[PDB]
Design a protein around this ligand. Sequence first.
Ligand SMILES: [Cl-]
Ligand SMILES: [Cl-]
Ligand SMILES: [Cl-]
Ligand SMILES: [Cl-]
Ligand SMILES: [Cl-]
Ligand SMILES: [Cl-]
Ligand SMILES: [Cl-]
Ligand SMILES: [Cl-]
Ligand SMILES: [Cl-]
Ligand SMILES: [Cl-]
Ligand SMILES: [Cl-]
Ligand SMILES: [Cl-]
Ligand SMILES: [Cl-]
Ligand SMILES: [Cl-]
Ligand SMILES: [Cl-]
Ligand SMILES: [Cl-]
Ligand SMILES: [Cl-]
Ligand SMILES: [Cl-]
Ligand SMILES: [Cl-]
Ligand SMILES: [Cl-]
Ligand code: NA
Ligand code: NA
Ligand code: NA
Ligand code: NA
Ligand code: NA
Ligand code: NA
Lengths: 106, 106
Amino acid sequence: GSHCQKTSLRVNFEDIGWDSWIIAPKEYEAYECKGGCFFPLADDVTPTKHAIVQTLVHLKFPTKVGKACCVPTKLSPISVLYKDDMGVPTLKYHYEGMSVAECGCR
Amino acid sequence: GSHCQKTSLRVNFEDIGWDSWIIAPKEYEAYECKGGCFFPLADDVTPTKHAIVQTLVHLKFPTKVGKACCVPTKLSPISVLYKDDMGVPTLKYHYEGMSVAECGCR
Ligand SMILES: [Cl-]
Ligand SMILES: [Cl-]
Ligand SMILES: [Cl-]
Ligand SMILES: [Cl-]
Ligand SMILES: [Cl-]
Ligand SMILES: [Cl-]
Ligand SMILES: [Cl-]
Ligand SMILES: [Cl-]
Ligand SMILES: [Cl-]
Ligand SMILES: [Cl-]
Ligand SMILES: [Cl-]
Ligand SMILES: [Cl-]
Ligand SMILES: [Cl-]
Ligand SMILES: [Cl-]
Ligand SMILES: [Cl-]
Ligand SMILES: [Cl-]
Ligand SMILES: [Cl-]
Ligand SMILES: [Cl-]
Ligand SMILES: [Cl-]
Ligand SMILES: [Cl-]
Ligand code: NA
Ligand code: NA
Ligand code: NA
Ligand code: NA
Ligand code: NA
Ligand code: NA
């Protein structure tokens, strides 16, 4: 059963070019939503009626319409130590939208 | 600029096998979110920080991590005339989550 779930994704801030303004941490766990949104669906997929309808339409017209996507439905914040406009290391205690909390078909 | 926007998708309830319980309408406009989530991004894409971070990581490791997805971020309801458990045509005035209102990279 390769369905929509949260899997591991470690993100190094230097690789994405954010080390120019983020001092710490060097890496953090962002996770990622991976998996198919096809039927039969599952309980924790938590689909919208539109993703269900869209998946059905994709099944009958695969070349015209795409299928639903496994995306983050809830995000959690992290804390980062960034450079202030005057070079002062300032802590952003709740940097929102950085880590995946829940996944779902949308 | 092939970016994340709302495009047309007409859904026939008979094709998706929902005509067994939905009397009317035969078809309705559900729309769909289509388009790339790559950079440079746009204003109405309205990305989360995780979709931005994920797209960056995808750019540097295309085979390990997938990119962000263009998905519905807000849904609108429709009205359907369905069969009651005793065969009575009943109107569901607000059948939620059926039509796309806004799109975005998630
Ligand atoms: Cl299965
Ligand atoms: Cl199902
Ligand atoms: Cl829904
Ligand atoms: Cl939902
Ligand atoms: Cl297919
Ligand atoms: Cl397509
Ligand atoms: Cl979100
Ligand atoms: Cl706290
Ligand atoms: Cl904060
Ligand atoms: Cl923030
Ligand atoms: Cl462009
Ligand atoms: Cl951008
Ligand atoms: Cl965000
Ligand atoms: Cl947002
Ligand atoms: Cl690519
Ligand atoms: Cl992949
Ligand atoms: Cl939604
Ligand atoms: Cl009304
Ligand atoms: Cl209602
Ligand atoms: Cl409803
Ligand atoms: Na087709
Ligand atoms: Na997907
Ligand atoms: Na999200
Ligand atoms: Na790679
Ligand atoms: Na997409
Ligand atoms: Na949605």
